Write a protein that holds these residues in place. Structure first.
Motif, PDB file in Angstrom:
ATOM      1  N   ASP A 101     -58.945  77.203  15.258  1.00  0.00           N
ATOM      2  CA  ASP A 101     -58.597  76.700  13.928  1.00  0.00           C
ATOM      3  C   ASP A 101     -59.069  77.684  12.864  1.00  0.00           C
ATOM      4  N   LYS A 102     -58.678  78.940  13.043  1.00  0.00           N
ATOM      5  CA  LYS A 102     -59.555  80.056  12.727  1.00  0.00           C
ATOM      6  C   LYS A 102     -59.773  80.193  11.220  1.00  0.00           C
ATOM      7  N   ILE A 103     -60.600  81.175  10.868  1.00  0.00           N
ATOM      8  CA  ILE A 103     -61.366  81.294   9.627  1.00  0.00           C
ATOM      9  C   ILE A 103     -61.988  79.947   9.283  1.00  0.00           C
ATOM     10  N   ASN A 110     -59.766  71.608   3.175  1.00  0.00           N
ATOM     11  CA  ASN A 110     -58.923  72.105   2.105  1.00  0.00           C
ATOM     12  C   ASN A 110     -58.720  71.018   1.045  1.00  0.00           C
ATOM     13  N   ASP A 198     -56.032  74.811   0.345  1.00  0.00           N
ATOM     14  CA  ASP A 198     -54.870  74.437   1.207  1.00  0.00           C
ATOM     15  C   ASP A 198     -53.613  75.260   1.001  1.00  0.00           C
ATOM     16  N   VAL A 200     -49.896  75.755  -0.280  1.00  0.00           N
ATOM     17  CA  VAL A 200     -48.823  74.771  -0.300  1.00  0.00           C
ATOM     18  C   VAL A 200     -47.842  75.074   0.823  1.00  0.00           C
ATOM     19  N   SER A 201     -46.942  74.125   1.061  1.00  0.00           N
ATOM     20  CA  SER A 201     -45.861  74.278   2.021  1.00  0.00           C
ATOM     21  C   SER A 201     -44.582  74.653   1.288  1.00  0.00           C
TER      22      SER A 201
ATOM     23  N   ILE B   3     -55.005  89.126   9.657  1.00  0.00           N
ATOM     24  CA  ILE B   3     -55.654  87.823   9.605  1.00  0.00           C
ATOM     25  C   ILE B   3     -54.724  86.886   8.846  1.00  0.00           C
ATOM     26  N   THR B   4     -54.033  86.020   9.584  1.00  0.00           N
ATOM     27  CA  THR B   4     -53.081  85.039   9.066  1.00  0.00           C
ATOM     28  C   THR B   4     -53.762  83.687   8.963  1.00  0.00           C
ATOM     29  N   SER B   5     -55.069  83.698   9.168  1.00  0.00           N
ATOM     30  CA  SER B   5     -55.789  82.694   9.935  1.00  0.00           C
ATOM     31  C   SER B   5     -55.762  81.285   9.341  1.00  0.00           C
ATOM     32  N   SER B   6     -56.194  80.327  10.176  1.00  0.00           N
ATOM     33  CA  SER B   6     -56.257  78.880   9.960  1.00  0.00           C
ATOM     34  C   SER B   6     -54.914  78.191   9.811  1.00  0.00           C
ATOM     35  N   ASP B   7     -54.838  77.311   8.821  1.00  0.00           N
ATOM     36  CA  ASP B   7     -53.755  76.351   8.735  1.00  0.00           C
ATOM     37  C   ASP B   7     -53.534  75.917   7.291  1.00  0.00           C
ATOM     38  N   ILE B   8     -52.319  75.471   7.019  1.00  0.00           N
ATOM     39  CA  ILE B   8     -51.881  75.115   5.680  1.00  0.00           C
ATOM     40  C   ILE B   8     -51.431  73.662   5.735  1.00  0.00           C
ATOM     41  N   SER B   9     -52.164  72.775   5.067  1.00  0.00           N
ATOM     42  CA  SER B   9     -51.650  71.424   4.920  1.00  0.00           C
ATOM     43  C   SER B   9     -50.500  71.426   3.931  1.00  0.00           C
ATOM     44  N   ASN B  10     -49.910  70.258   3.742  1.00  0.00           N
ATOM     45  CA  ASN B  10     -48.623  70.168   3.086  1.00  0.00           C
ATOM     46  C   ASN B  10     -48.697  69.168   1.946  1.00  0.00           C
ATOM     47  N   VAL B  11     -48.519  69.669   0.734  1.00  0.00           N
ATOM     48  CA  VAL B  11     -48.355  68.829  -0.439  1.00  0.00           C
ATOM     49  C   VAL B  11     -46.915  68.942  -0.904  1.00  0.00           C
ATOM     50  N   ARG B  13     -44.316  66.804  -3.978  1.00  0.00           N
ATOM     51  CA  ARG B  13     -44.372  65.895  -5.109  1.00  0.00           C
ATOM     52  C   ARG B  13     -43.044  65.175  -5.236  1.00  0.00           C
ATOM     53  N   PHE B  96     -50.911  64.658   0.181  1.00  0.00           N
ATOM     54  CA  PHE B  96     -51.376  65.750   1.008  1.00  0.00           C
ATOM     55  C   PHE B  96     -51.110  65.321   2.436  1.00  0.00           C
ATOM     56  N   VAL B 100     -44.771  68.710   7.432  1.00  0.00           N
ATOM     57  CA  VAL B 100     -43.735  68.503   6.434  1.00  0.00           C
ATOM     58  C   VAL B 100     -42.856  67.342   6.870  1.00  0.00           C
TER      59      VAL B 100
ATOM     60  N   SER C   5     -59.900  83.503   5.603  1.00  0.00           N
ATOM     61  CA  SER C   5     -58.610  83.435   4.927  1.00  0.00           C
ATOM     62  C   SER C   5     -58.736  82.425   3.792  1.00  0.00           C
ATOM     63  N   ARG C  41     -45.526  71.948 -12.429  1.00  0.00           N
ATOM     64  CA  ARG C  41     -46.595  71.294 -13.167  1.00  0.00           C
ATOM     65  C   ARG C  41     -46.581  71.783 -14.602  1.00  0.00           C
TER      66      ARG C  41
END
Lengths: 250, 100, 100, 50
Positions: A101-103, A110, A198, A200-201, B3-11, B13, B96, B100, C5, C41
């Protein structure tokens, strides 16, 4: 190595472990005194997460510090993976609780939220912000339930926030942990706080499409247009760079 | 190299322009799937108060379609609000969300 | 030596204390390149109404540099605001822009 | 590897190298011509920061 066996394992230099804390808390001590070797990486990992729940306990016992104090560093992080080396300044460097779940953004989770229902008026300062670790100095949420004034880079009587606990006024830096608010607000008027993270998507495109029409050389006499017109000597240049098609930043 | 690292949650609106008065609830949240409760997002342009760890009279949130009062648990799909709000006073809801 | 990151690449924002009145538009939005239309926003410290899928009279937004009235399309570069707002009240823009 | 030996180290692929530059800058000269093999990392890392 199993949580079932001990609450402790120790010191195997290159023998890597995938650790259970379920049965009991693991207190893992590492080889002591280490001579002139260093260079020795140790590998601890979750074959599953009973990290968090019942925590890890990592120990550099006296000897050569992991980092700083060397007081045992404890992993409550659910997934985690461990690499620390004996490093010439008598130091064992393990890297930011990379879980896989890196970095990291850790218990940060987030982008997150907290609200202060304000009571007994006052309460201008708000302590520790989000529960543990740090706030993030990058961006702000704070609220009267109307959005607060922008915080600003340099801290102005204009831009309304205290920044931690300034005895009179607003603190000229802003520490993550403690945060001050210029208004006492009121009982029933809430202060509500976040920092930012976080990303955004993007939902991008969902299909679309492109098509190009070029005519050669003078026969156009005109240059390329968007993905509509292209122009070149066709036999001279094979392929295409495409800005030649319509481009949009997905 | 990267380093692309980790994860992106999704917001995402979705603004709700309030009309007709009424409008103490909003259904399905974002049309597909569910809302993610842990971070409540709703605005009157005043950003609305927490739903909270403890649903309260203090917390002003209806939570889906409760018969009377308003539902103590929150549900992702449907939400309710204690307020009729007002037409033109916009209920602006976000999530959040995990995927998606 | 742990490596990290980040967010700011995928989340950034900028907020304006208004002066001089006028100021019905805001140029480049944030310093360089493109804003992304899909997520908007504008905050008066109330979070201003949707620009929406459709630029409307309901939706209050100027959109770039429209000669008269305020533009129907939204360029990410330049934006406008129907209101001059007022001196001392703060417009707050926040962008959502994806990484590659 | 220690800076004191060579001012340069060379070429041995699958060997991890804990590097000391203290004595002298390490000029690490890796093999050339390499055929079509690829598939092969080299490992160099800091046992400490020189």
């Amino acid at each position: 190595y199993n949580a079932s066996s001990g609450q402790t394992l120790t010191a195997e230099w290159g023998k890597s472990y995938a650790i259970n804390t379920s049965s009991g808390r693991v207190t893992i001590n590492l080889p002591k005194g280490t001579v002139n070797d260093y260079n020795k990486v140790i590998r601890a990992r979750d074959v599953f997460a009973t990290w968090n729940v019942n925590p890890v306990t990592l120990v550099a016992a006296s000897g050569d510090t992991i980092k700083g104090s060397a007081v045992p560093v404890e992993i409550n992080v659910r997934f985690s993976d461990l690499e620390l080396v004996y490093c010439a300044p008598g130091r064992w460097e393990y890297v930011k609780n990379k879980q896989i779940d890196k970095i990291t953004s850790s218990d940060i989770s987030n982008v997150a939220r907290k609200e202060f229902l304000v009571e007994v008026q006052g309460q201008t300062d708000f302590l520790d912000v989000f529960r543990g670790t740090s706030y993030n100095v990058n961006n702000i949420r704070v609220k009267h339930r109307g959005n607060e004034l922008y915080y600003g880079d340099v801290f102005s009587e204009n831009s309304d926030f205290g920044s931690p606990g300034e005895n009179e006024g607003e603190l000229v830096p802003l520490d993550g942990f403690n945060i001050r608010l210029r208004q006492p607000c009121n009982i029933g008027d809430t202060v509500q706080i976040e920092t930012f993270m976080d990303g955004v998507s993007q939902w991008r495109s969902s299909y679309t499409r492109r098509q190009i029409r070029l005519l050669d050389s003078k026969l156009t006499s005109k240059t390329s247009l968007e993905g509509s017109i292209y122009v070149t000597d066709l036999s001279t240049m094979k392929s295409i760079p495409f800005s030649a098609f319509g481009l949009i930043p997905g």
